[PDB]
Paper text:
We crystallized three forms of truncated [name] (aa 1–361) with substitutions in several of these metal ion co-ordinating residues, i.e. D37A, [name], and the Omenn Syndrome patient mutation H35D. The overall architecture of the three variants is almost identical to WT [name]. The D37A structure crystallizes with only one nickel ion (M1); Both the [name] and H35D variants exhibited loss of the M1 ion. By contrast, all three variants retained the Zn ion in the zinc finger-like motif of the β-CASP domain. Histidines 33 and 35 are the first two histidine residues in the HxHxDH motif (M1 binding) in the active site. In the absence of active site metal ions, the loop comprising residues 113–119 moves away from the active site and a small rearrangement occurs in α8 (residues 348–358). In both the [name] and H35D variants, α8 moves slightly closer towards β14, compared to the WT and D37A variant. In [name] and H35D variants, both β-strand E and α-helix E shifted upward and away from the zinc finger like motif. Differential scanning fluorimetry (DSF) analyses showed that both [name] and H35D variants are substantially destabilized with ΔTm around -13°C compared to WT [name]. Our D37A, [name], and H35D variants lost the ability to digest DNA substrate in vitro, in accord with results with full-length variants.
[name] ([name]/[name]) is an endonuclease that plays a key role in development of B- and T-lymphocytes and in dsDNA break repair by non-homologous end-joining (NHEJ). [name] is phosphorylated by DNA-PKcs and acts to open DNA hairpin intermediates generated during V(D)J and class-switch recombination. [name] belongs to a superfamily of nucleases containing metallo-β-lactamase (MBL) and β-CASP (CPSF-[name]-SNM1-Pso2) domains.
Residue numbers in the entry: 3 to 343, 346 to 361
The structure:
């Protein structure tokens, strides 16, 4: 529910390109999650870019590379500027009419394992603010980010605009990335090593975001992962070489036409059912967030749902305990939820005790 503008710097728009964001002096994109790209190729945005020539879109190098592979975003090509990771970079913001000059320093920080995903730290003459985008970091990772600190202590951060997808005490703990990855790996390994005819379908609905899962499975098991499309990774060999559009592989992450219901699926999306007329022996594995209360113990990241079907713990977002740790550490004046699980009322109030206001 973040609508693009932070109170401290209203002339910049982040992860939202419609409505009030049509008057931005600069744009920012944290990652190629579809829900962060609302309005990014709307005719009204194109209309506005034609009549405001010094407006740029800023993002990570990987995000820029991903965007410029898509024909529908190539109208941006002249005006997308990447900023290197953890490299504080001064940007000038131009008032097209009145000529007001505005200078801000932006630093891109890692946000988690989605390709090109970043947090944006903004430092200007109205305080320091952090926009996380979607994020989940390792233990101590924020503490190790030198550019979040000054003189040994955390920077004085006025406001944090953060991913509160699981900002409720019921989502207290989520198994770690390492636990999730190891679980899926060992499940896949135990299946595909039985014979060349044993195959896995990874049921991942989004077109973007699961690439670190595919690359790790591919690296560890020596198999390319089937995908619908890999041209976005044309210039990214470390991702590209773990993927394939050829369906003759033991690991598939191909996707059904988005229109189809889950209950209508009867086979791998790409339609391969046999090799040498030997039927393929298929299990389905669906990445799915699993969580545990404060007083509970974590259980197996793999949940069996049928003879040939499984769910596997996976999260793009921090648990409630991880959110608390992050905000306790940053100790901002304000914390604003980007996502409502409830209302901005339970969640803003849940975060209040971690802030200085
Ligand atoms: Zn396939």
């Amino acid at each position: 529910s973040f609508e693009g503008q932070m109170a401290e710097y209203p002339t910049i728009s982040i992860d939202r390109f419609d409505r009030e964001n049509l008057r931005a002096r600069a744009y920012f994109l944290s990652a190629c999650h579809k829900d962060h790209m609302k309005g990014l190729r709307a005719p009204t945005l194109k209309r506005r870019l034609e009549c405001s020539l010094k407006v740029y879109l800023y993002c990570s190098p990987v995000t820029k590379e991903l965007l410029l592979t898509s024909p529908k975003y190539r109208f941006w090509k002249k005006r997308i500027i990447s900023i290197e990771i953890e490299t504080p970079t001064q940007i000038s913001l131009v008032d097209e009419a009145s000529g007001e000059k505005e200078e801000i320093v932006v630093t891109l920080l890692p946000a988690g394992h989605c390709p090109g995903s970043v947090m944006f730290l903004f430092q200007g003459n109205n305080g320091t603010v952090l926009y996380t985008g979607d994020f989940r970091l390792a233990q101590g990772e924020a503490a190790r980010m030198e550019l979040l600190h000054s003189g040994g202590r955390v920077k004085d951060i006025q406001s944090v605009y953060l991913d509160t997808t699981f900002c409720d005490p019921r989502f207290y703990q989520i198994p770690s990335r390492e636990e999730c990855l190891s679980g899926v790996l060992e499940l896949v390994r135990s299946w595909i090593t039985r014979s060349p005819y044993h195959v896995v379908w990874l049921n991942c609905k989004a077109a973007y975001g699961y690439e670190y899962l595919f690359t790790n499975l591919s690296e560890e098991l020596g198999v390319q992962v089937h995908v619908n499309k890999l041209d976005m990774f044309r210039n990214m060999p470390e991702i590209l070489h773990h993927l394939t559009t050829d369906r003759n592989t033991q690991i598939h992450a191909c996707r059904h036409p988005k229109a189809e219901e889950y209950f209508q699926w009867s086979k791998l999306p790409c339609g391969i059912t046999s090799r040498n007329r030997i039927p393929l022996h298929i299990i389905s594995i669906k990445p799915s967030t699993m969580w545990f209360g404060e007083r509970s113990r974590k259980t197996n990241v793999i949940v069996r749902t049928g003879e040939s079907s499984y769910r596997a713990c996976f999260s793009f977002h921090s648990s409630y305990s991880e959110i608390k740790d992050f905000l306790s550490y940053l100790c901002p004046v304000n914390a604003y939820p980007n996502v409502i699980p409830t209302t901005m009322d339970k969640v803003v109030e849940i975060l209040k005790p971690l802030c200085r206001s």
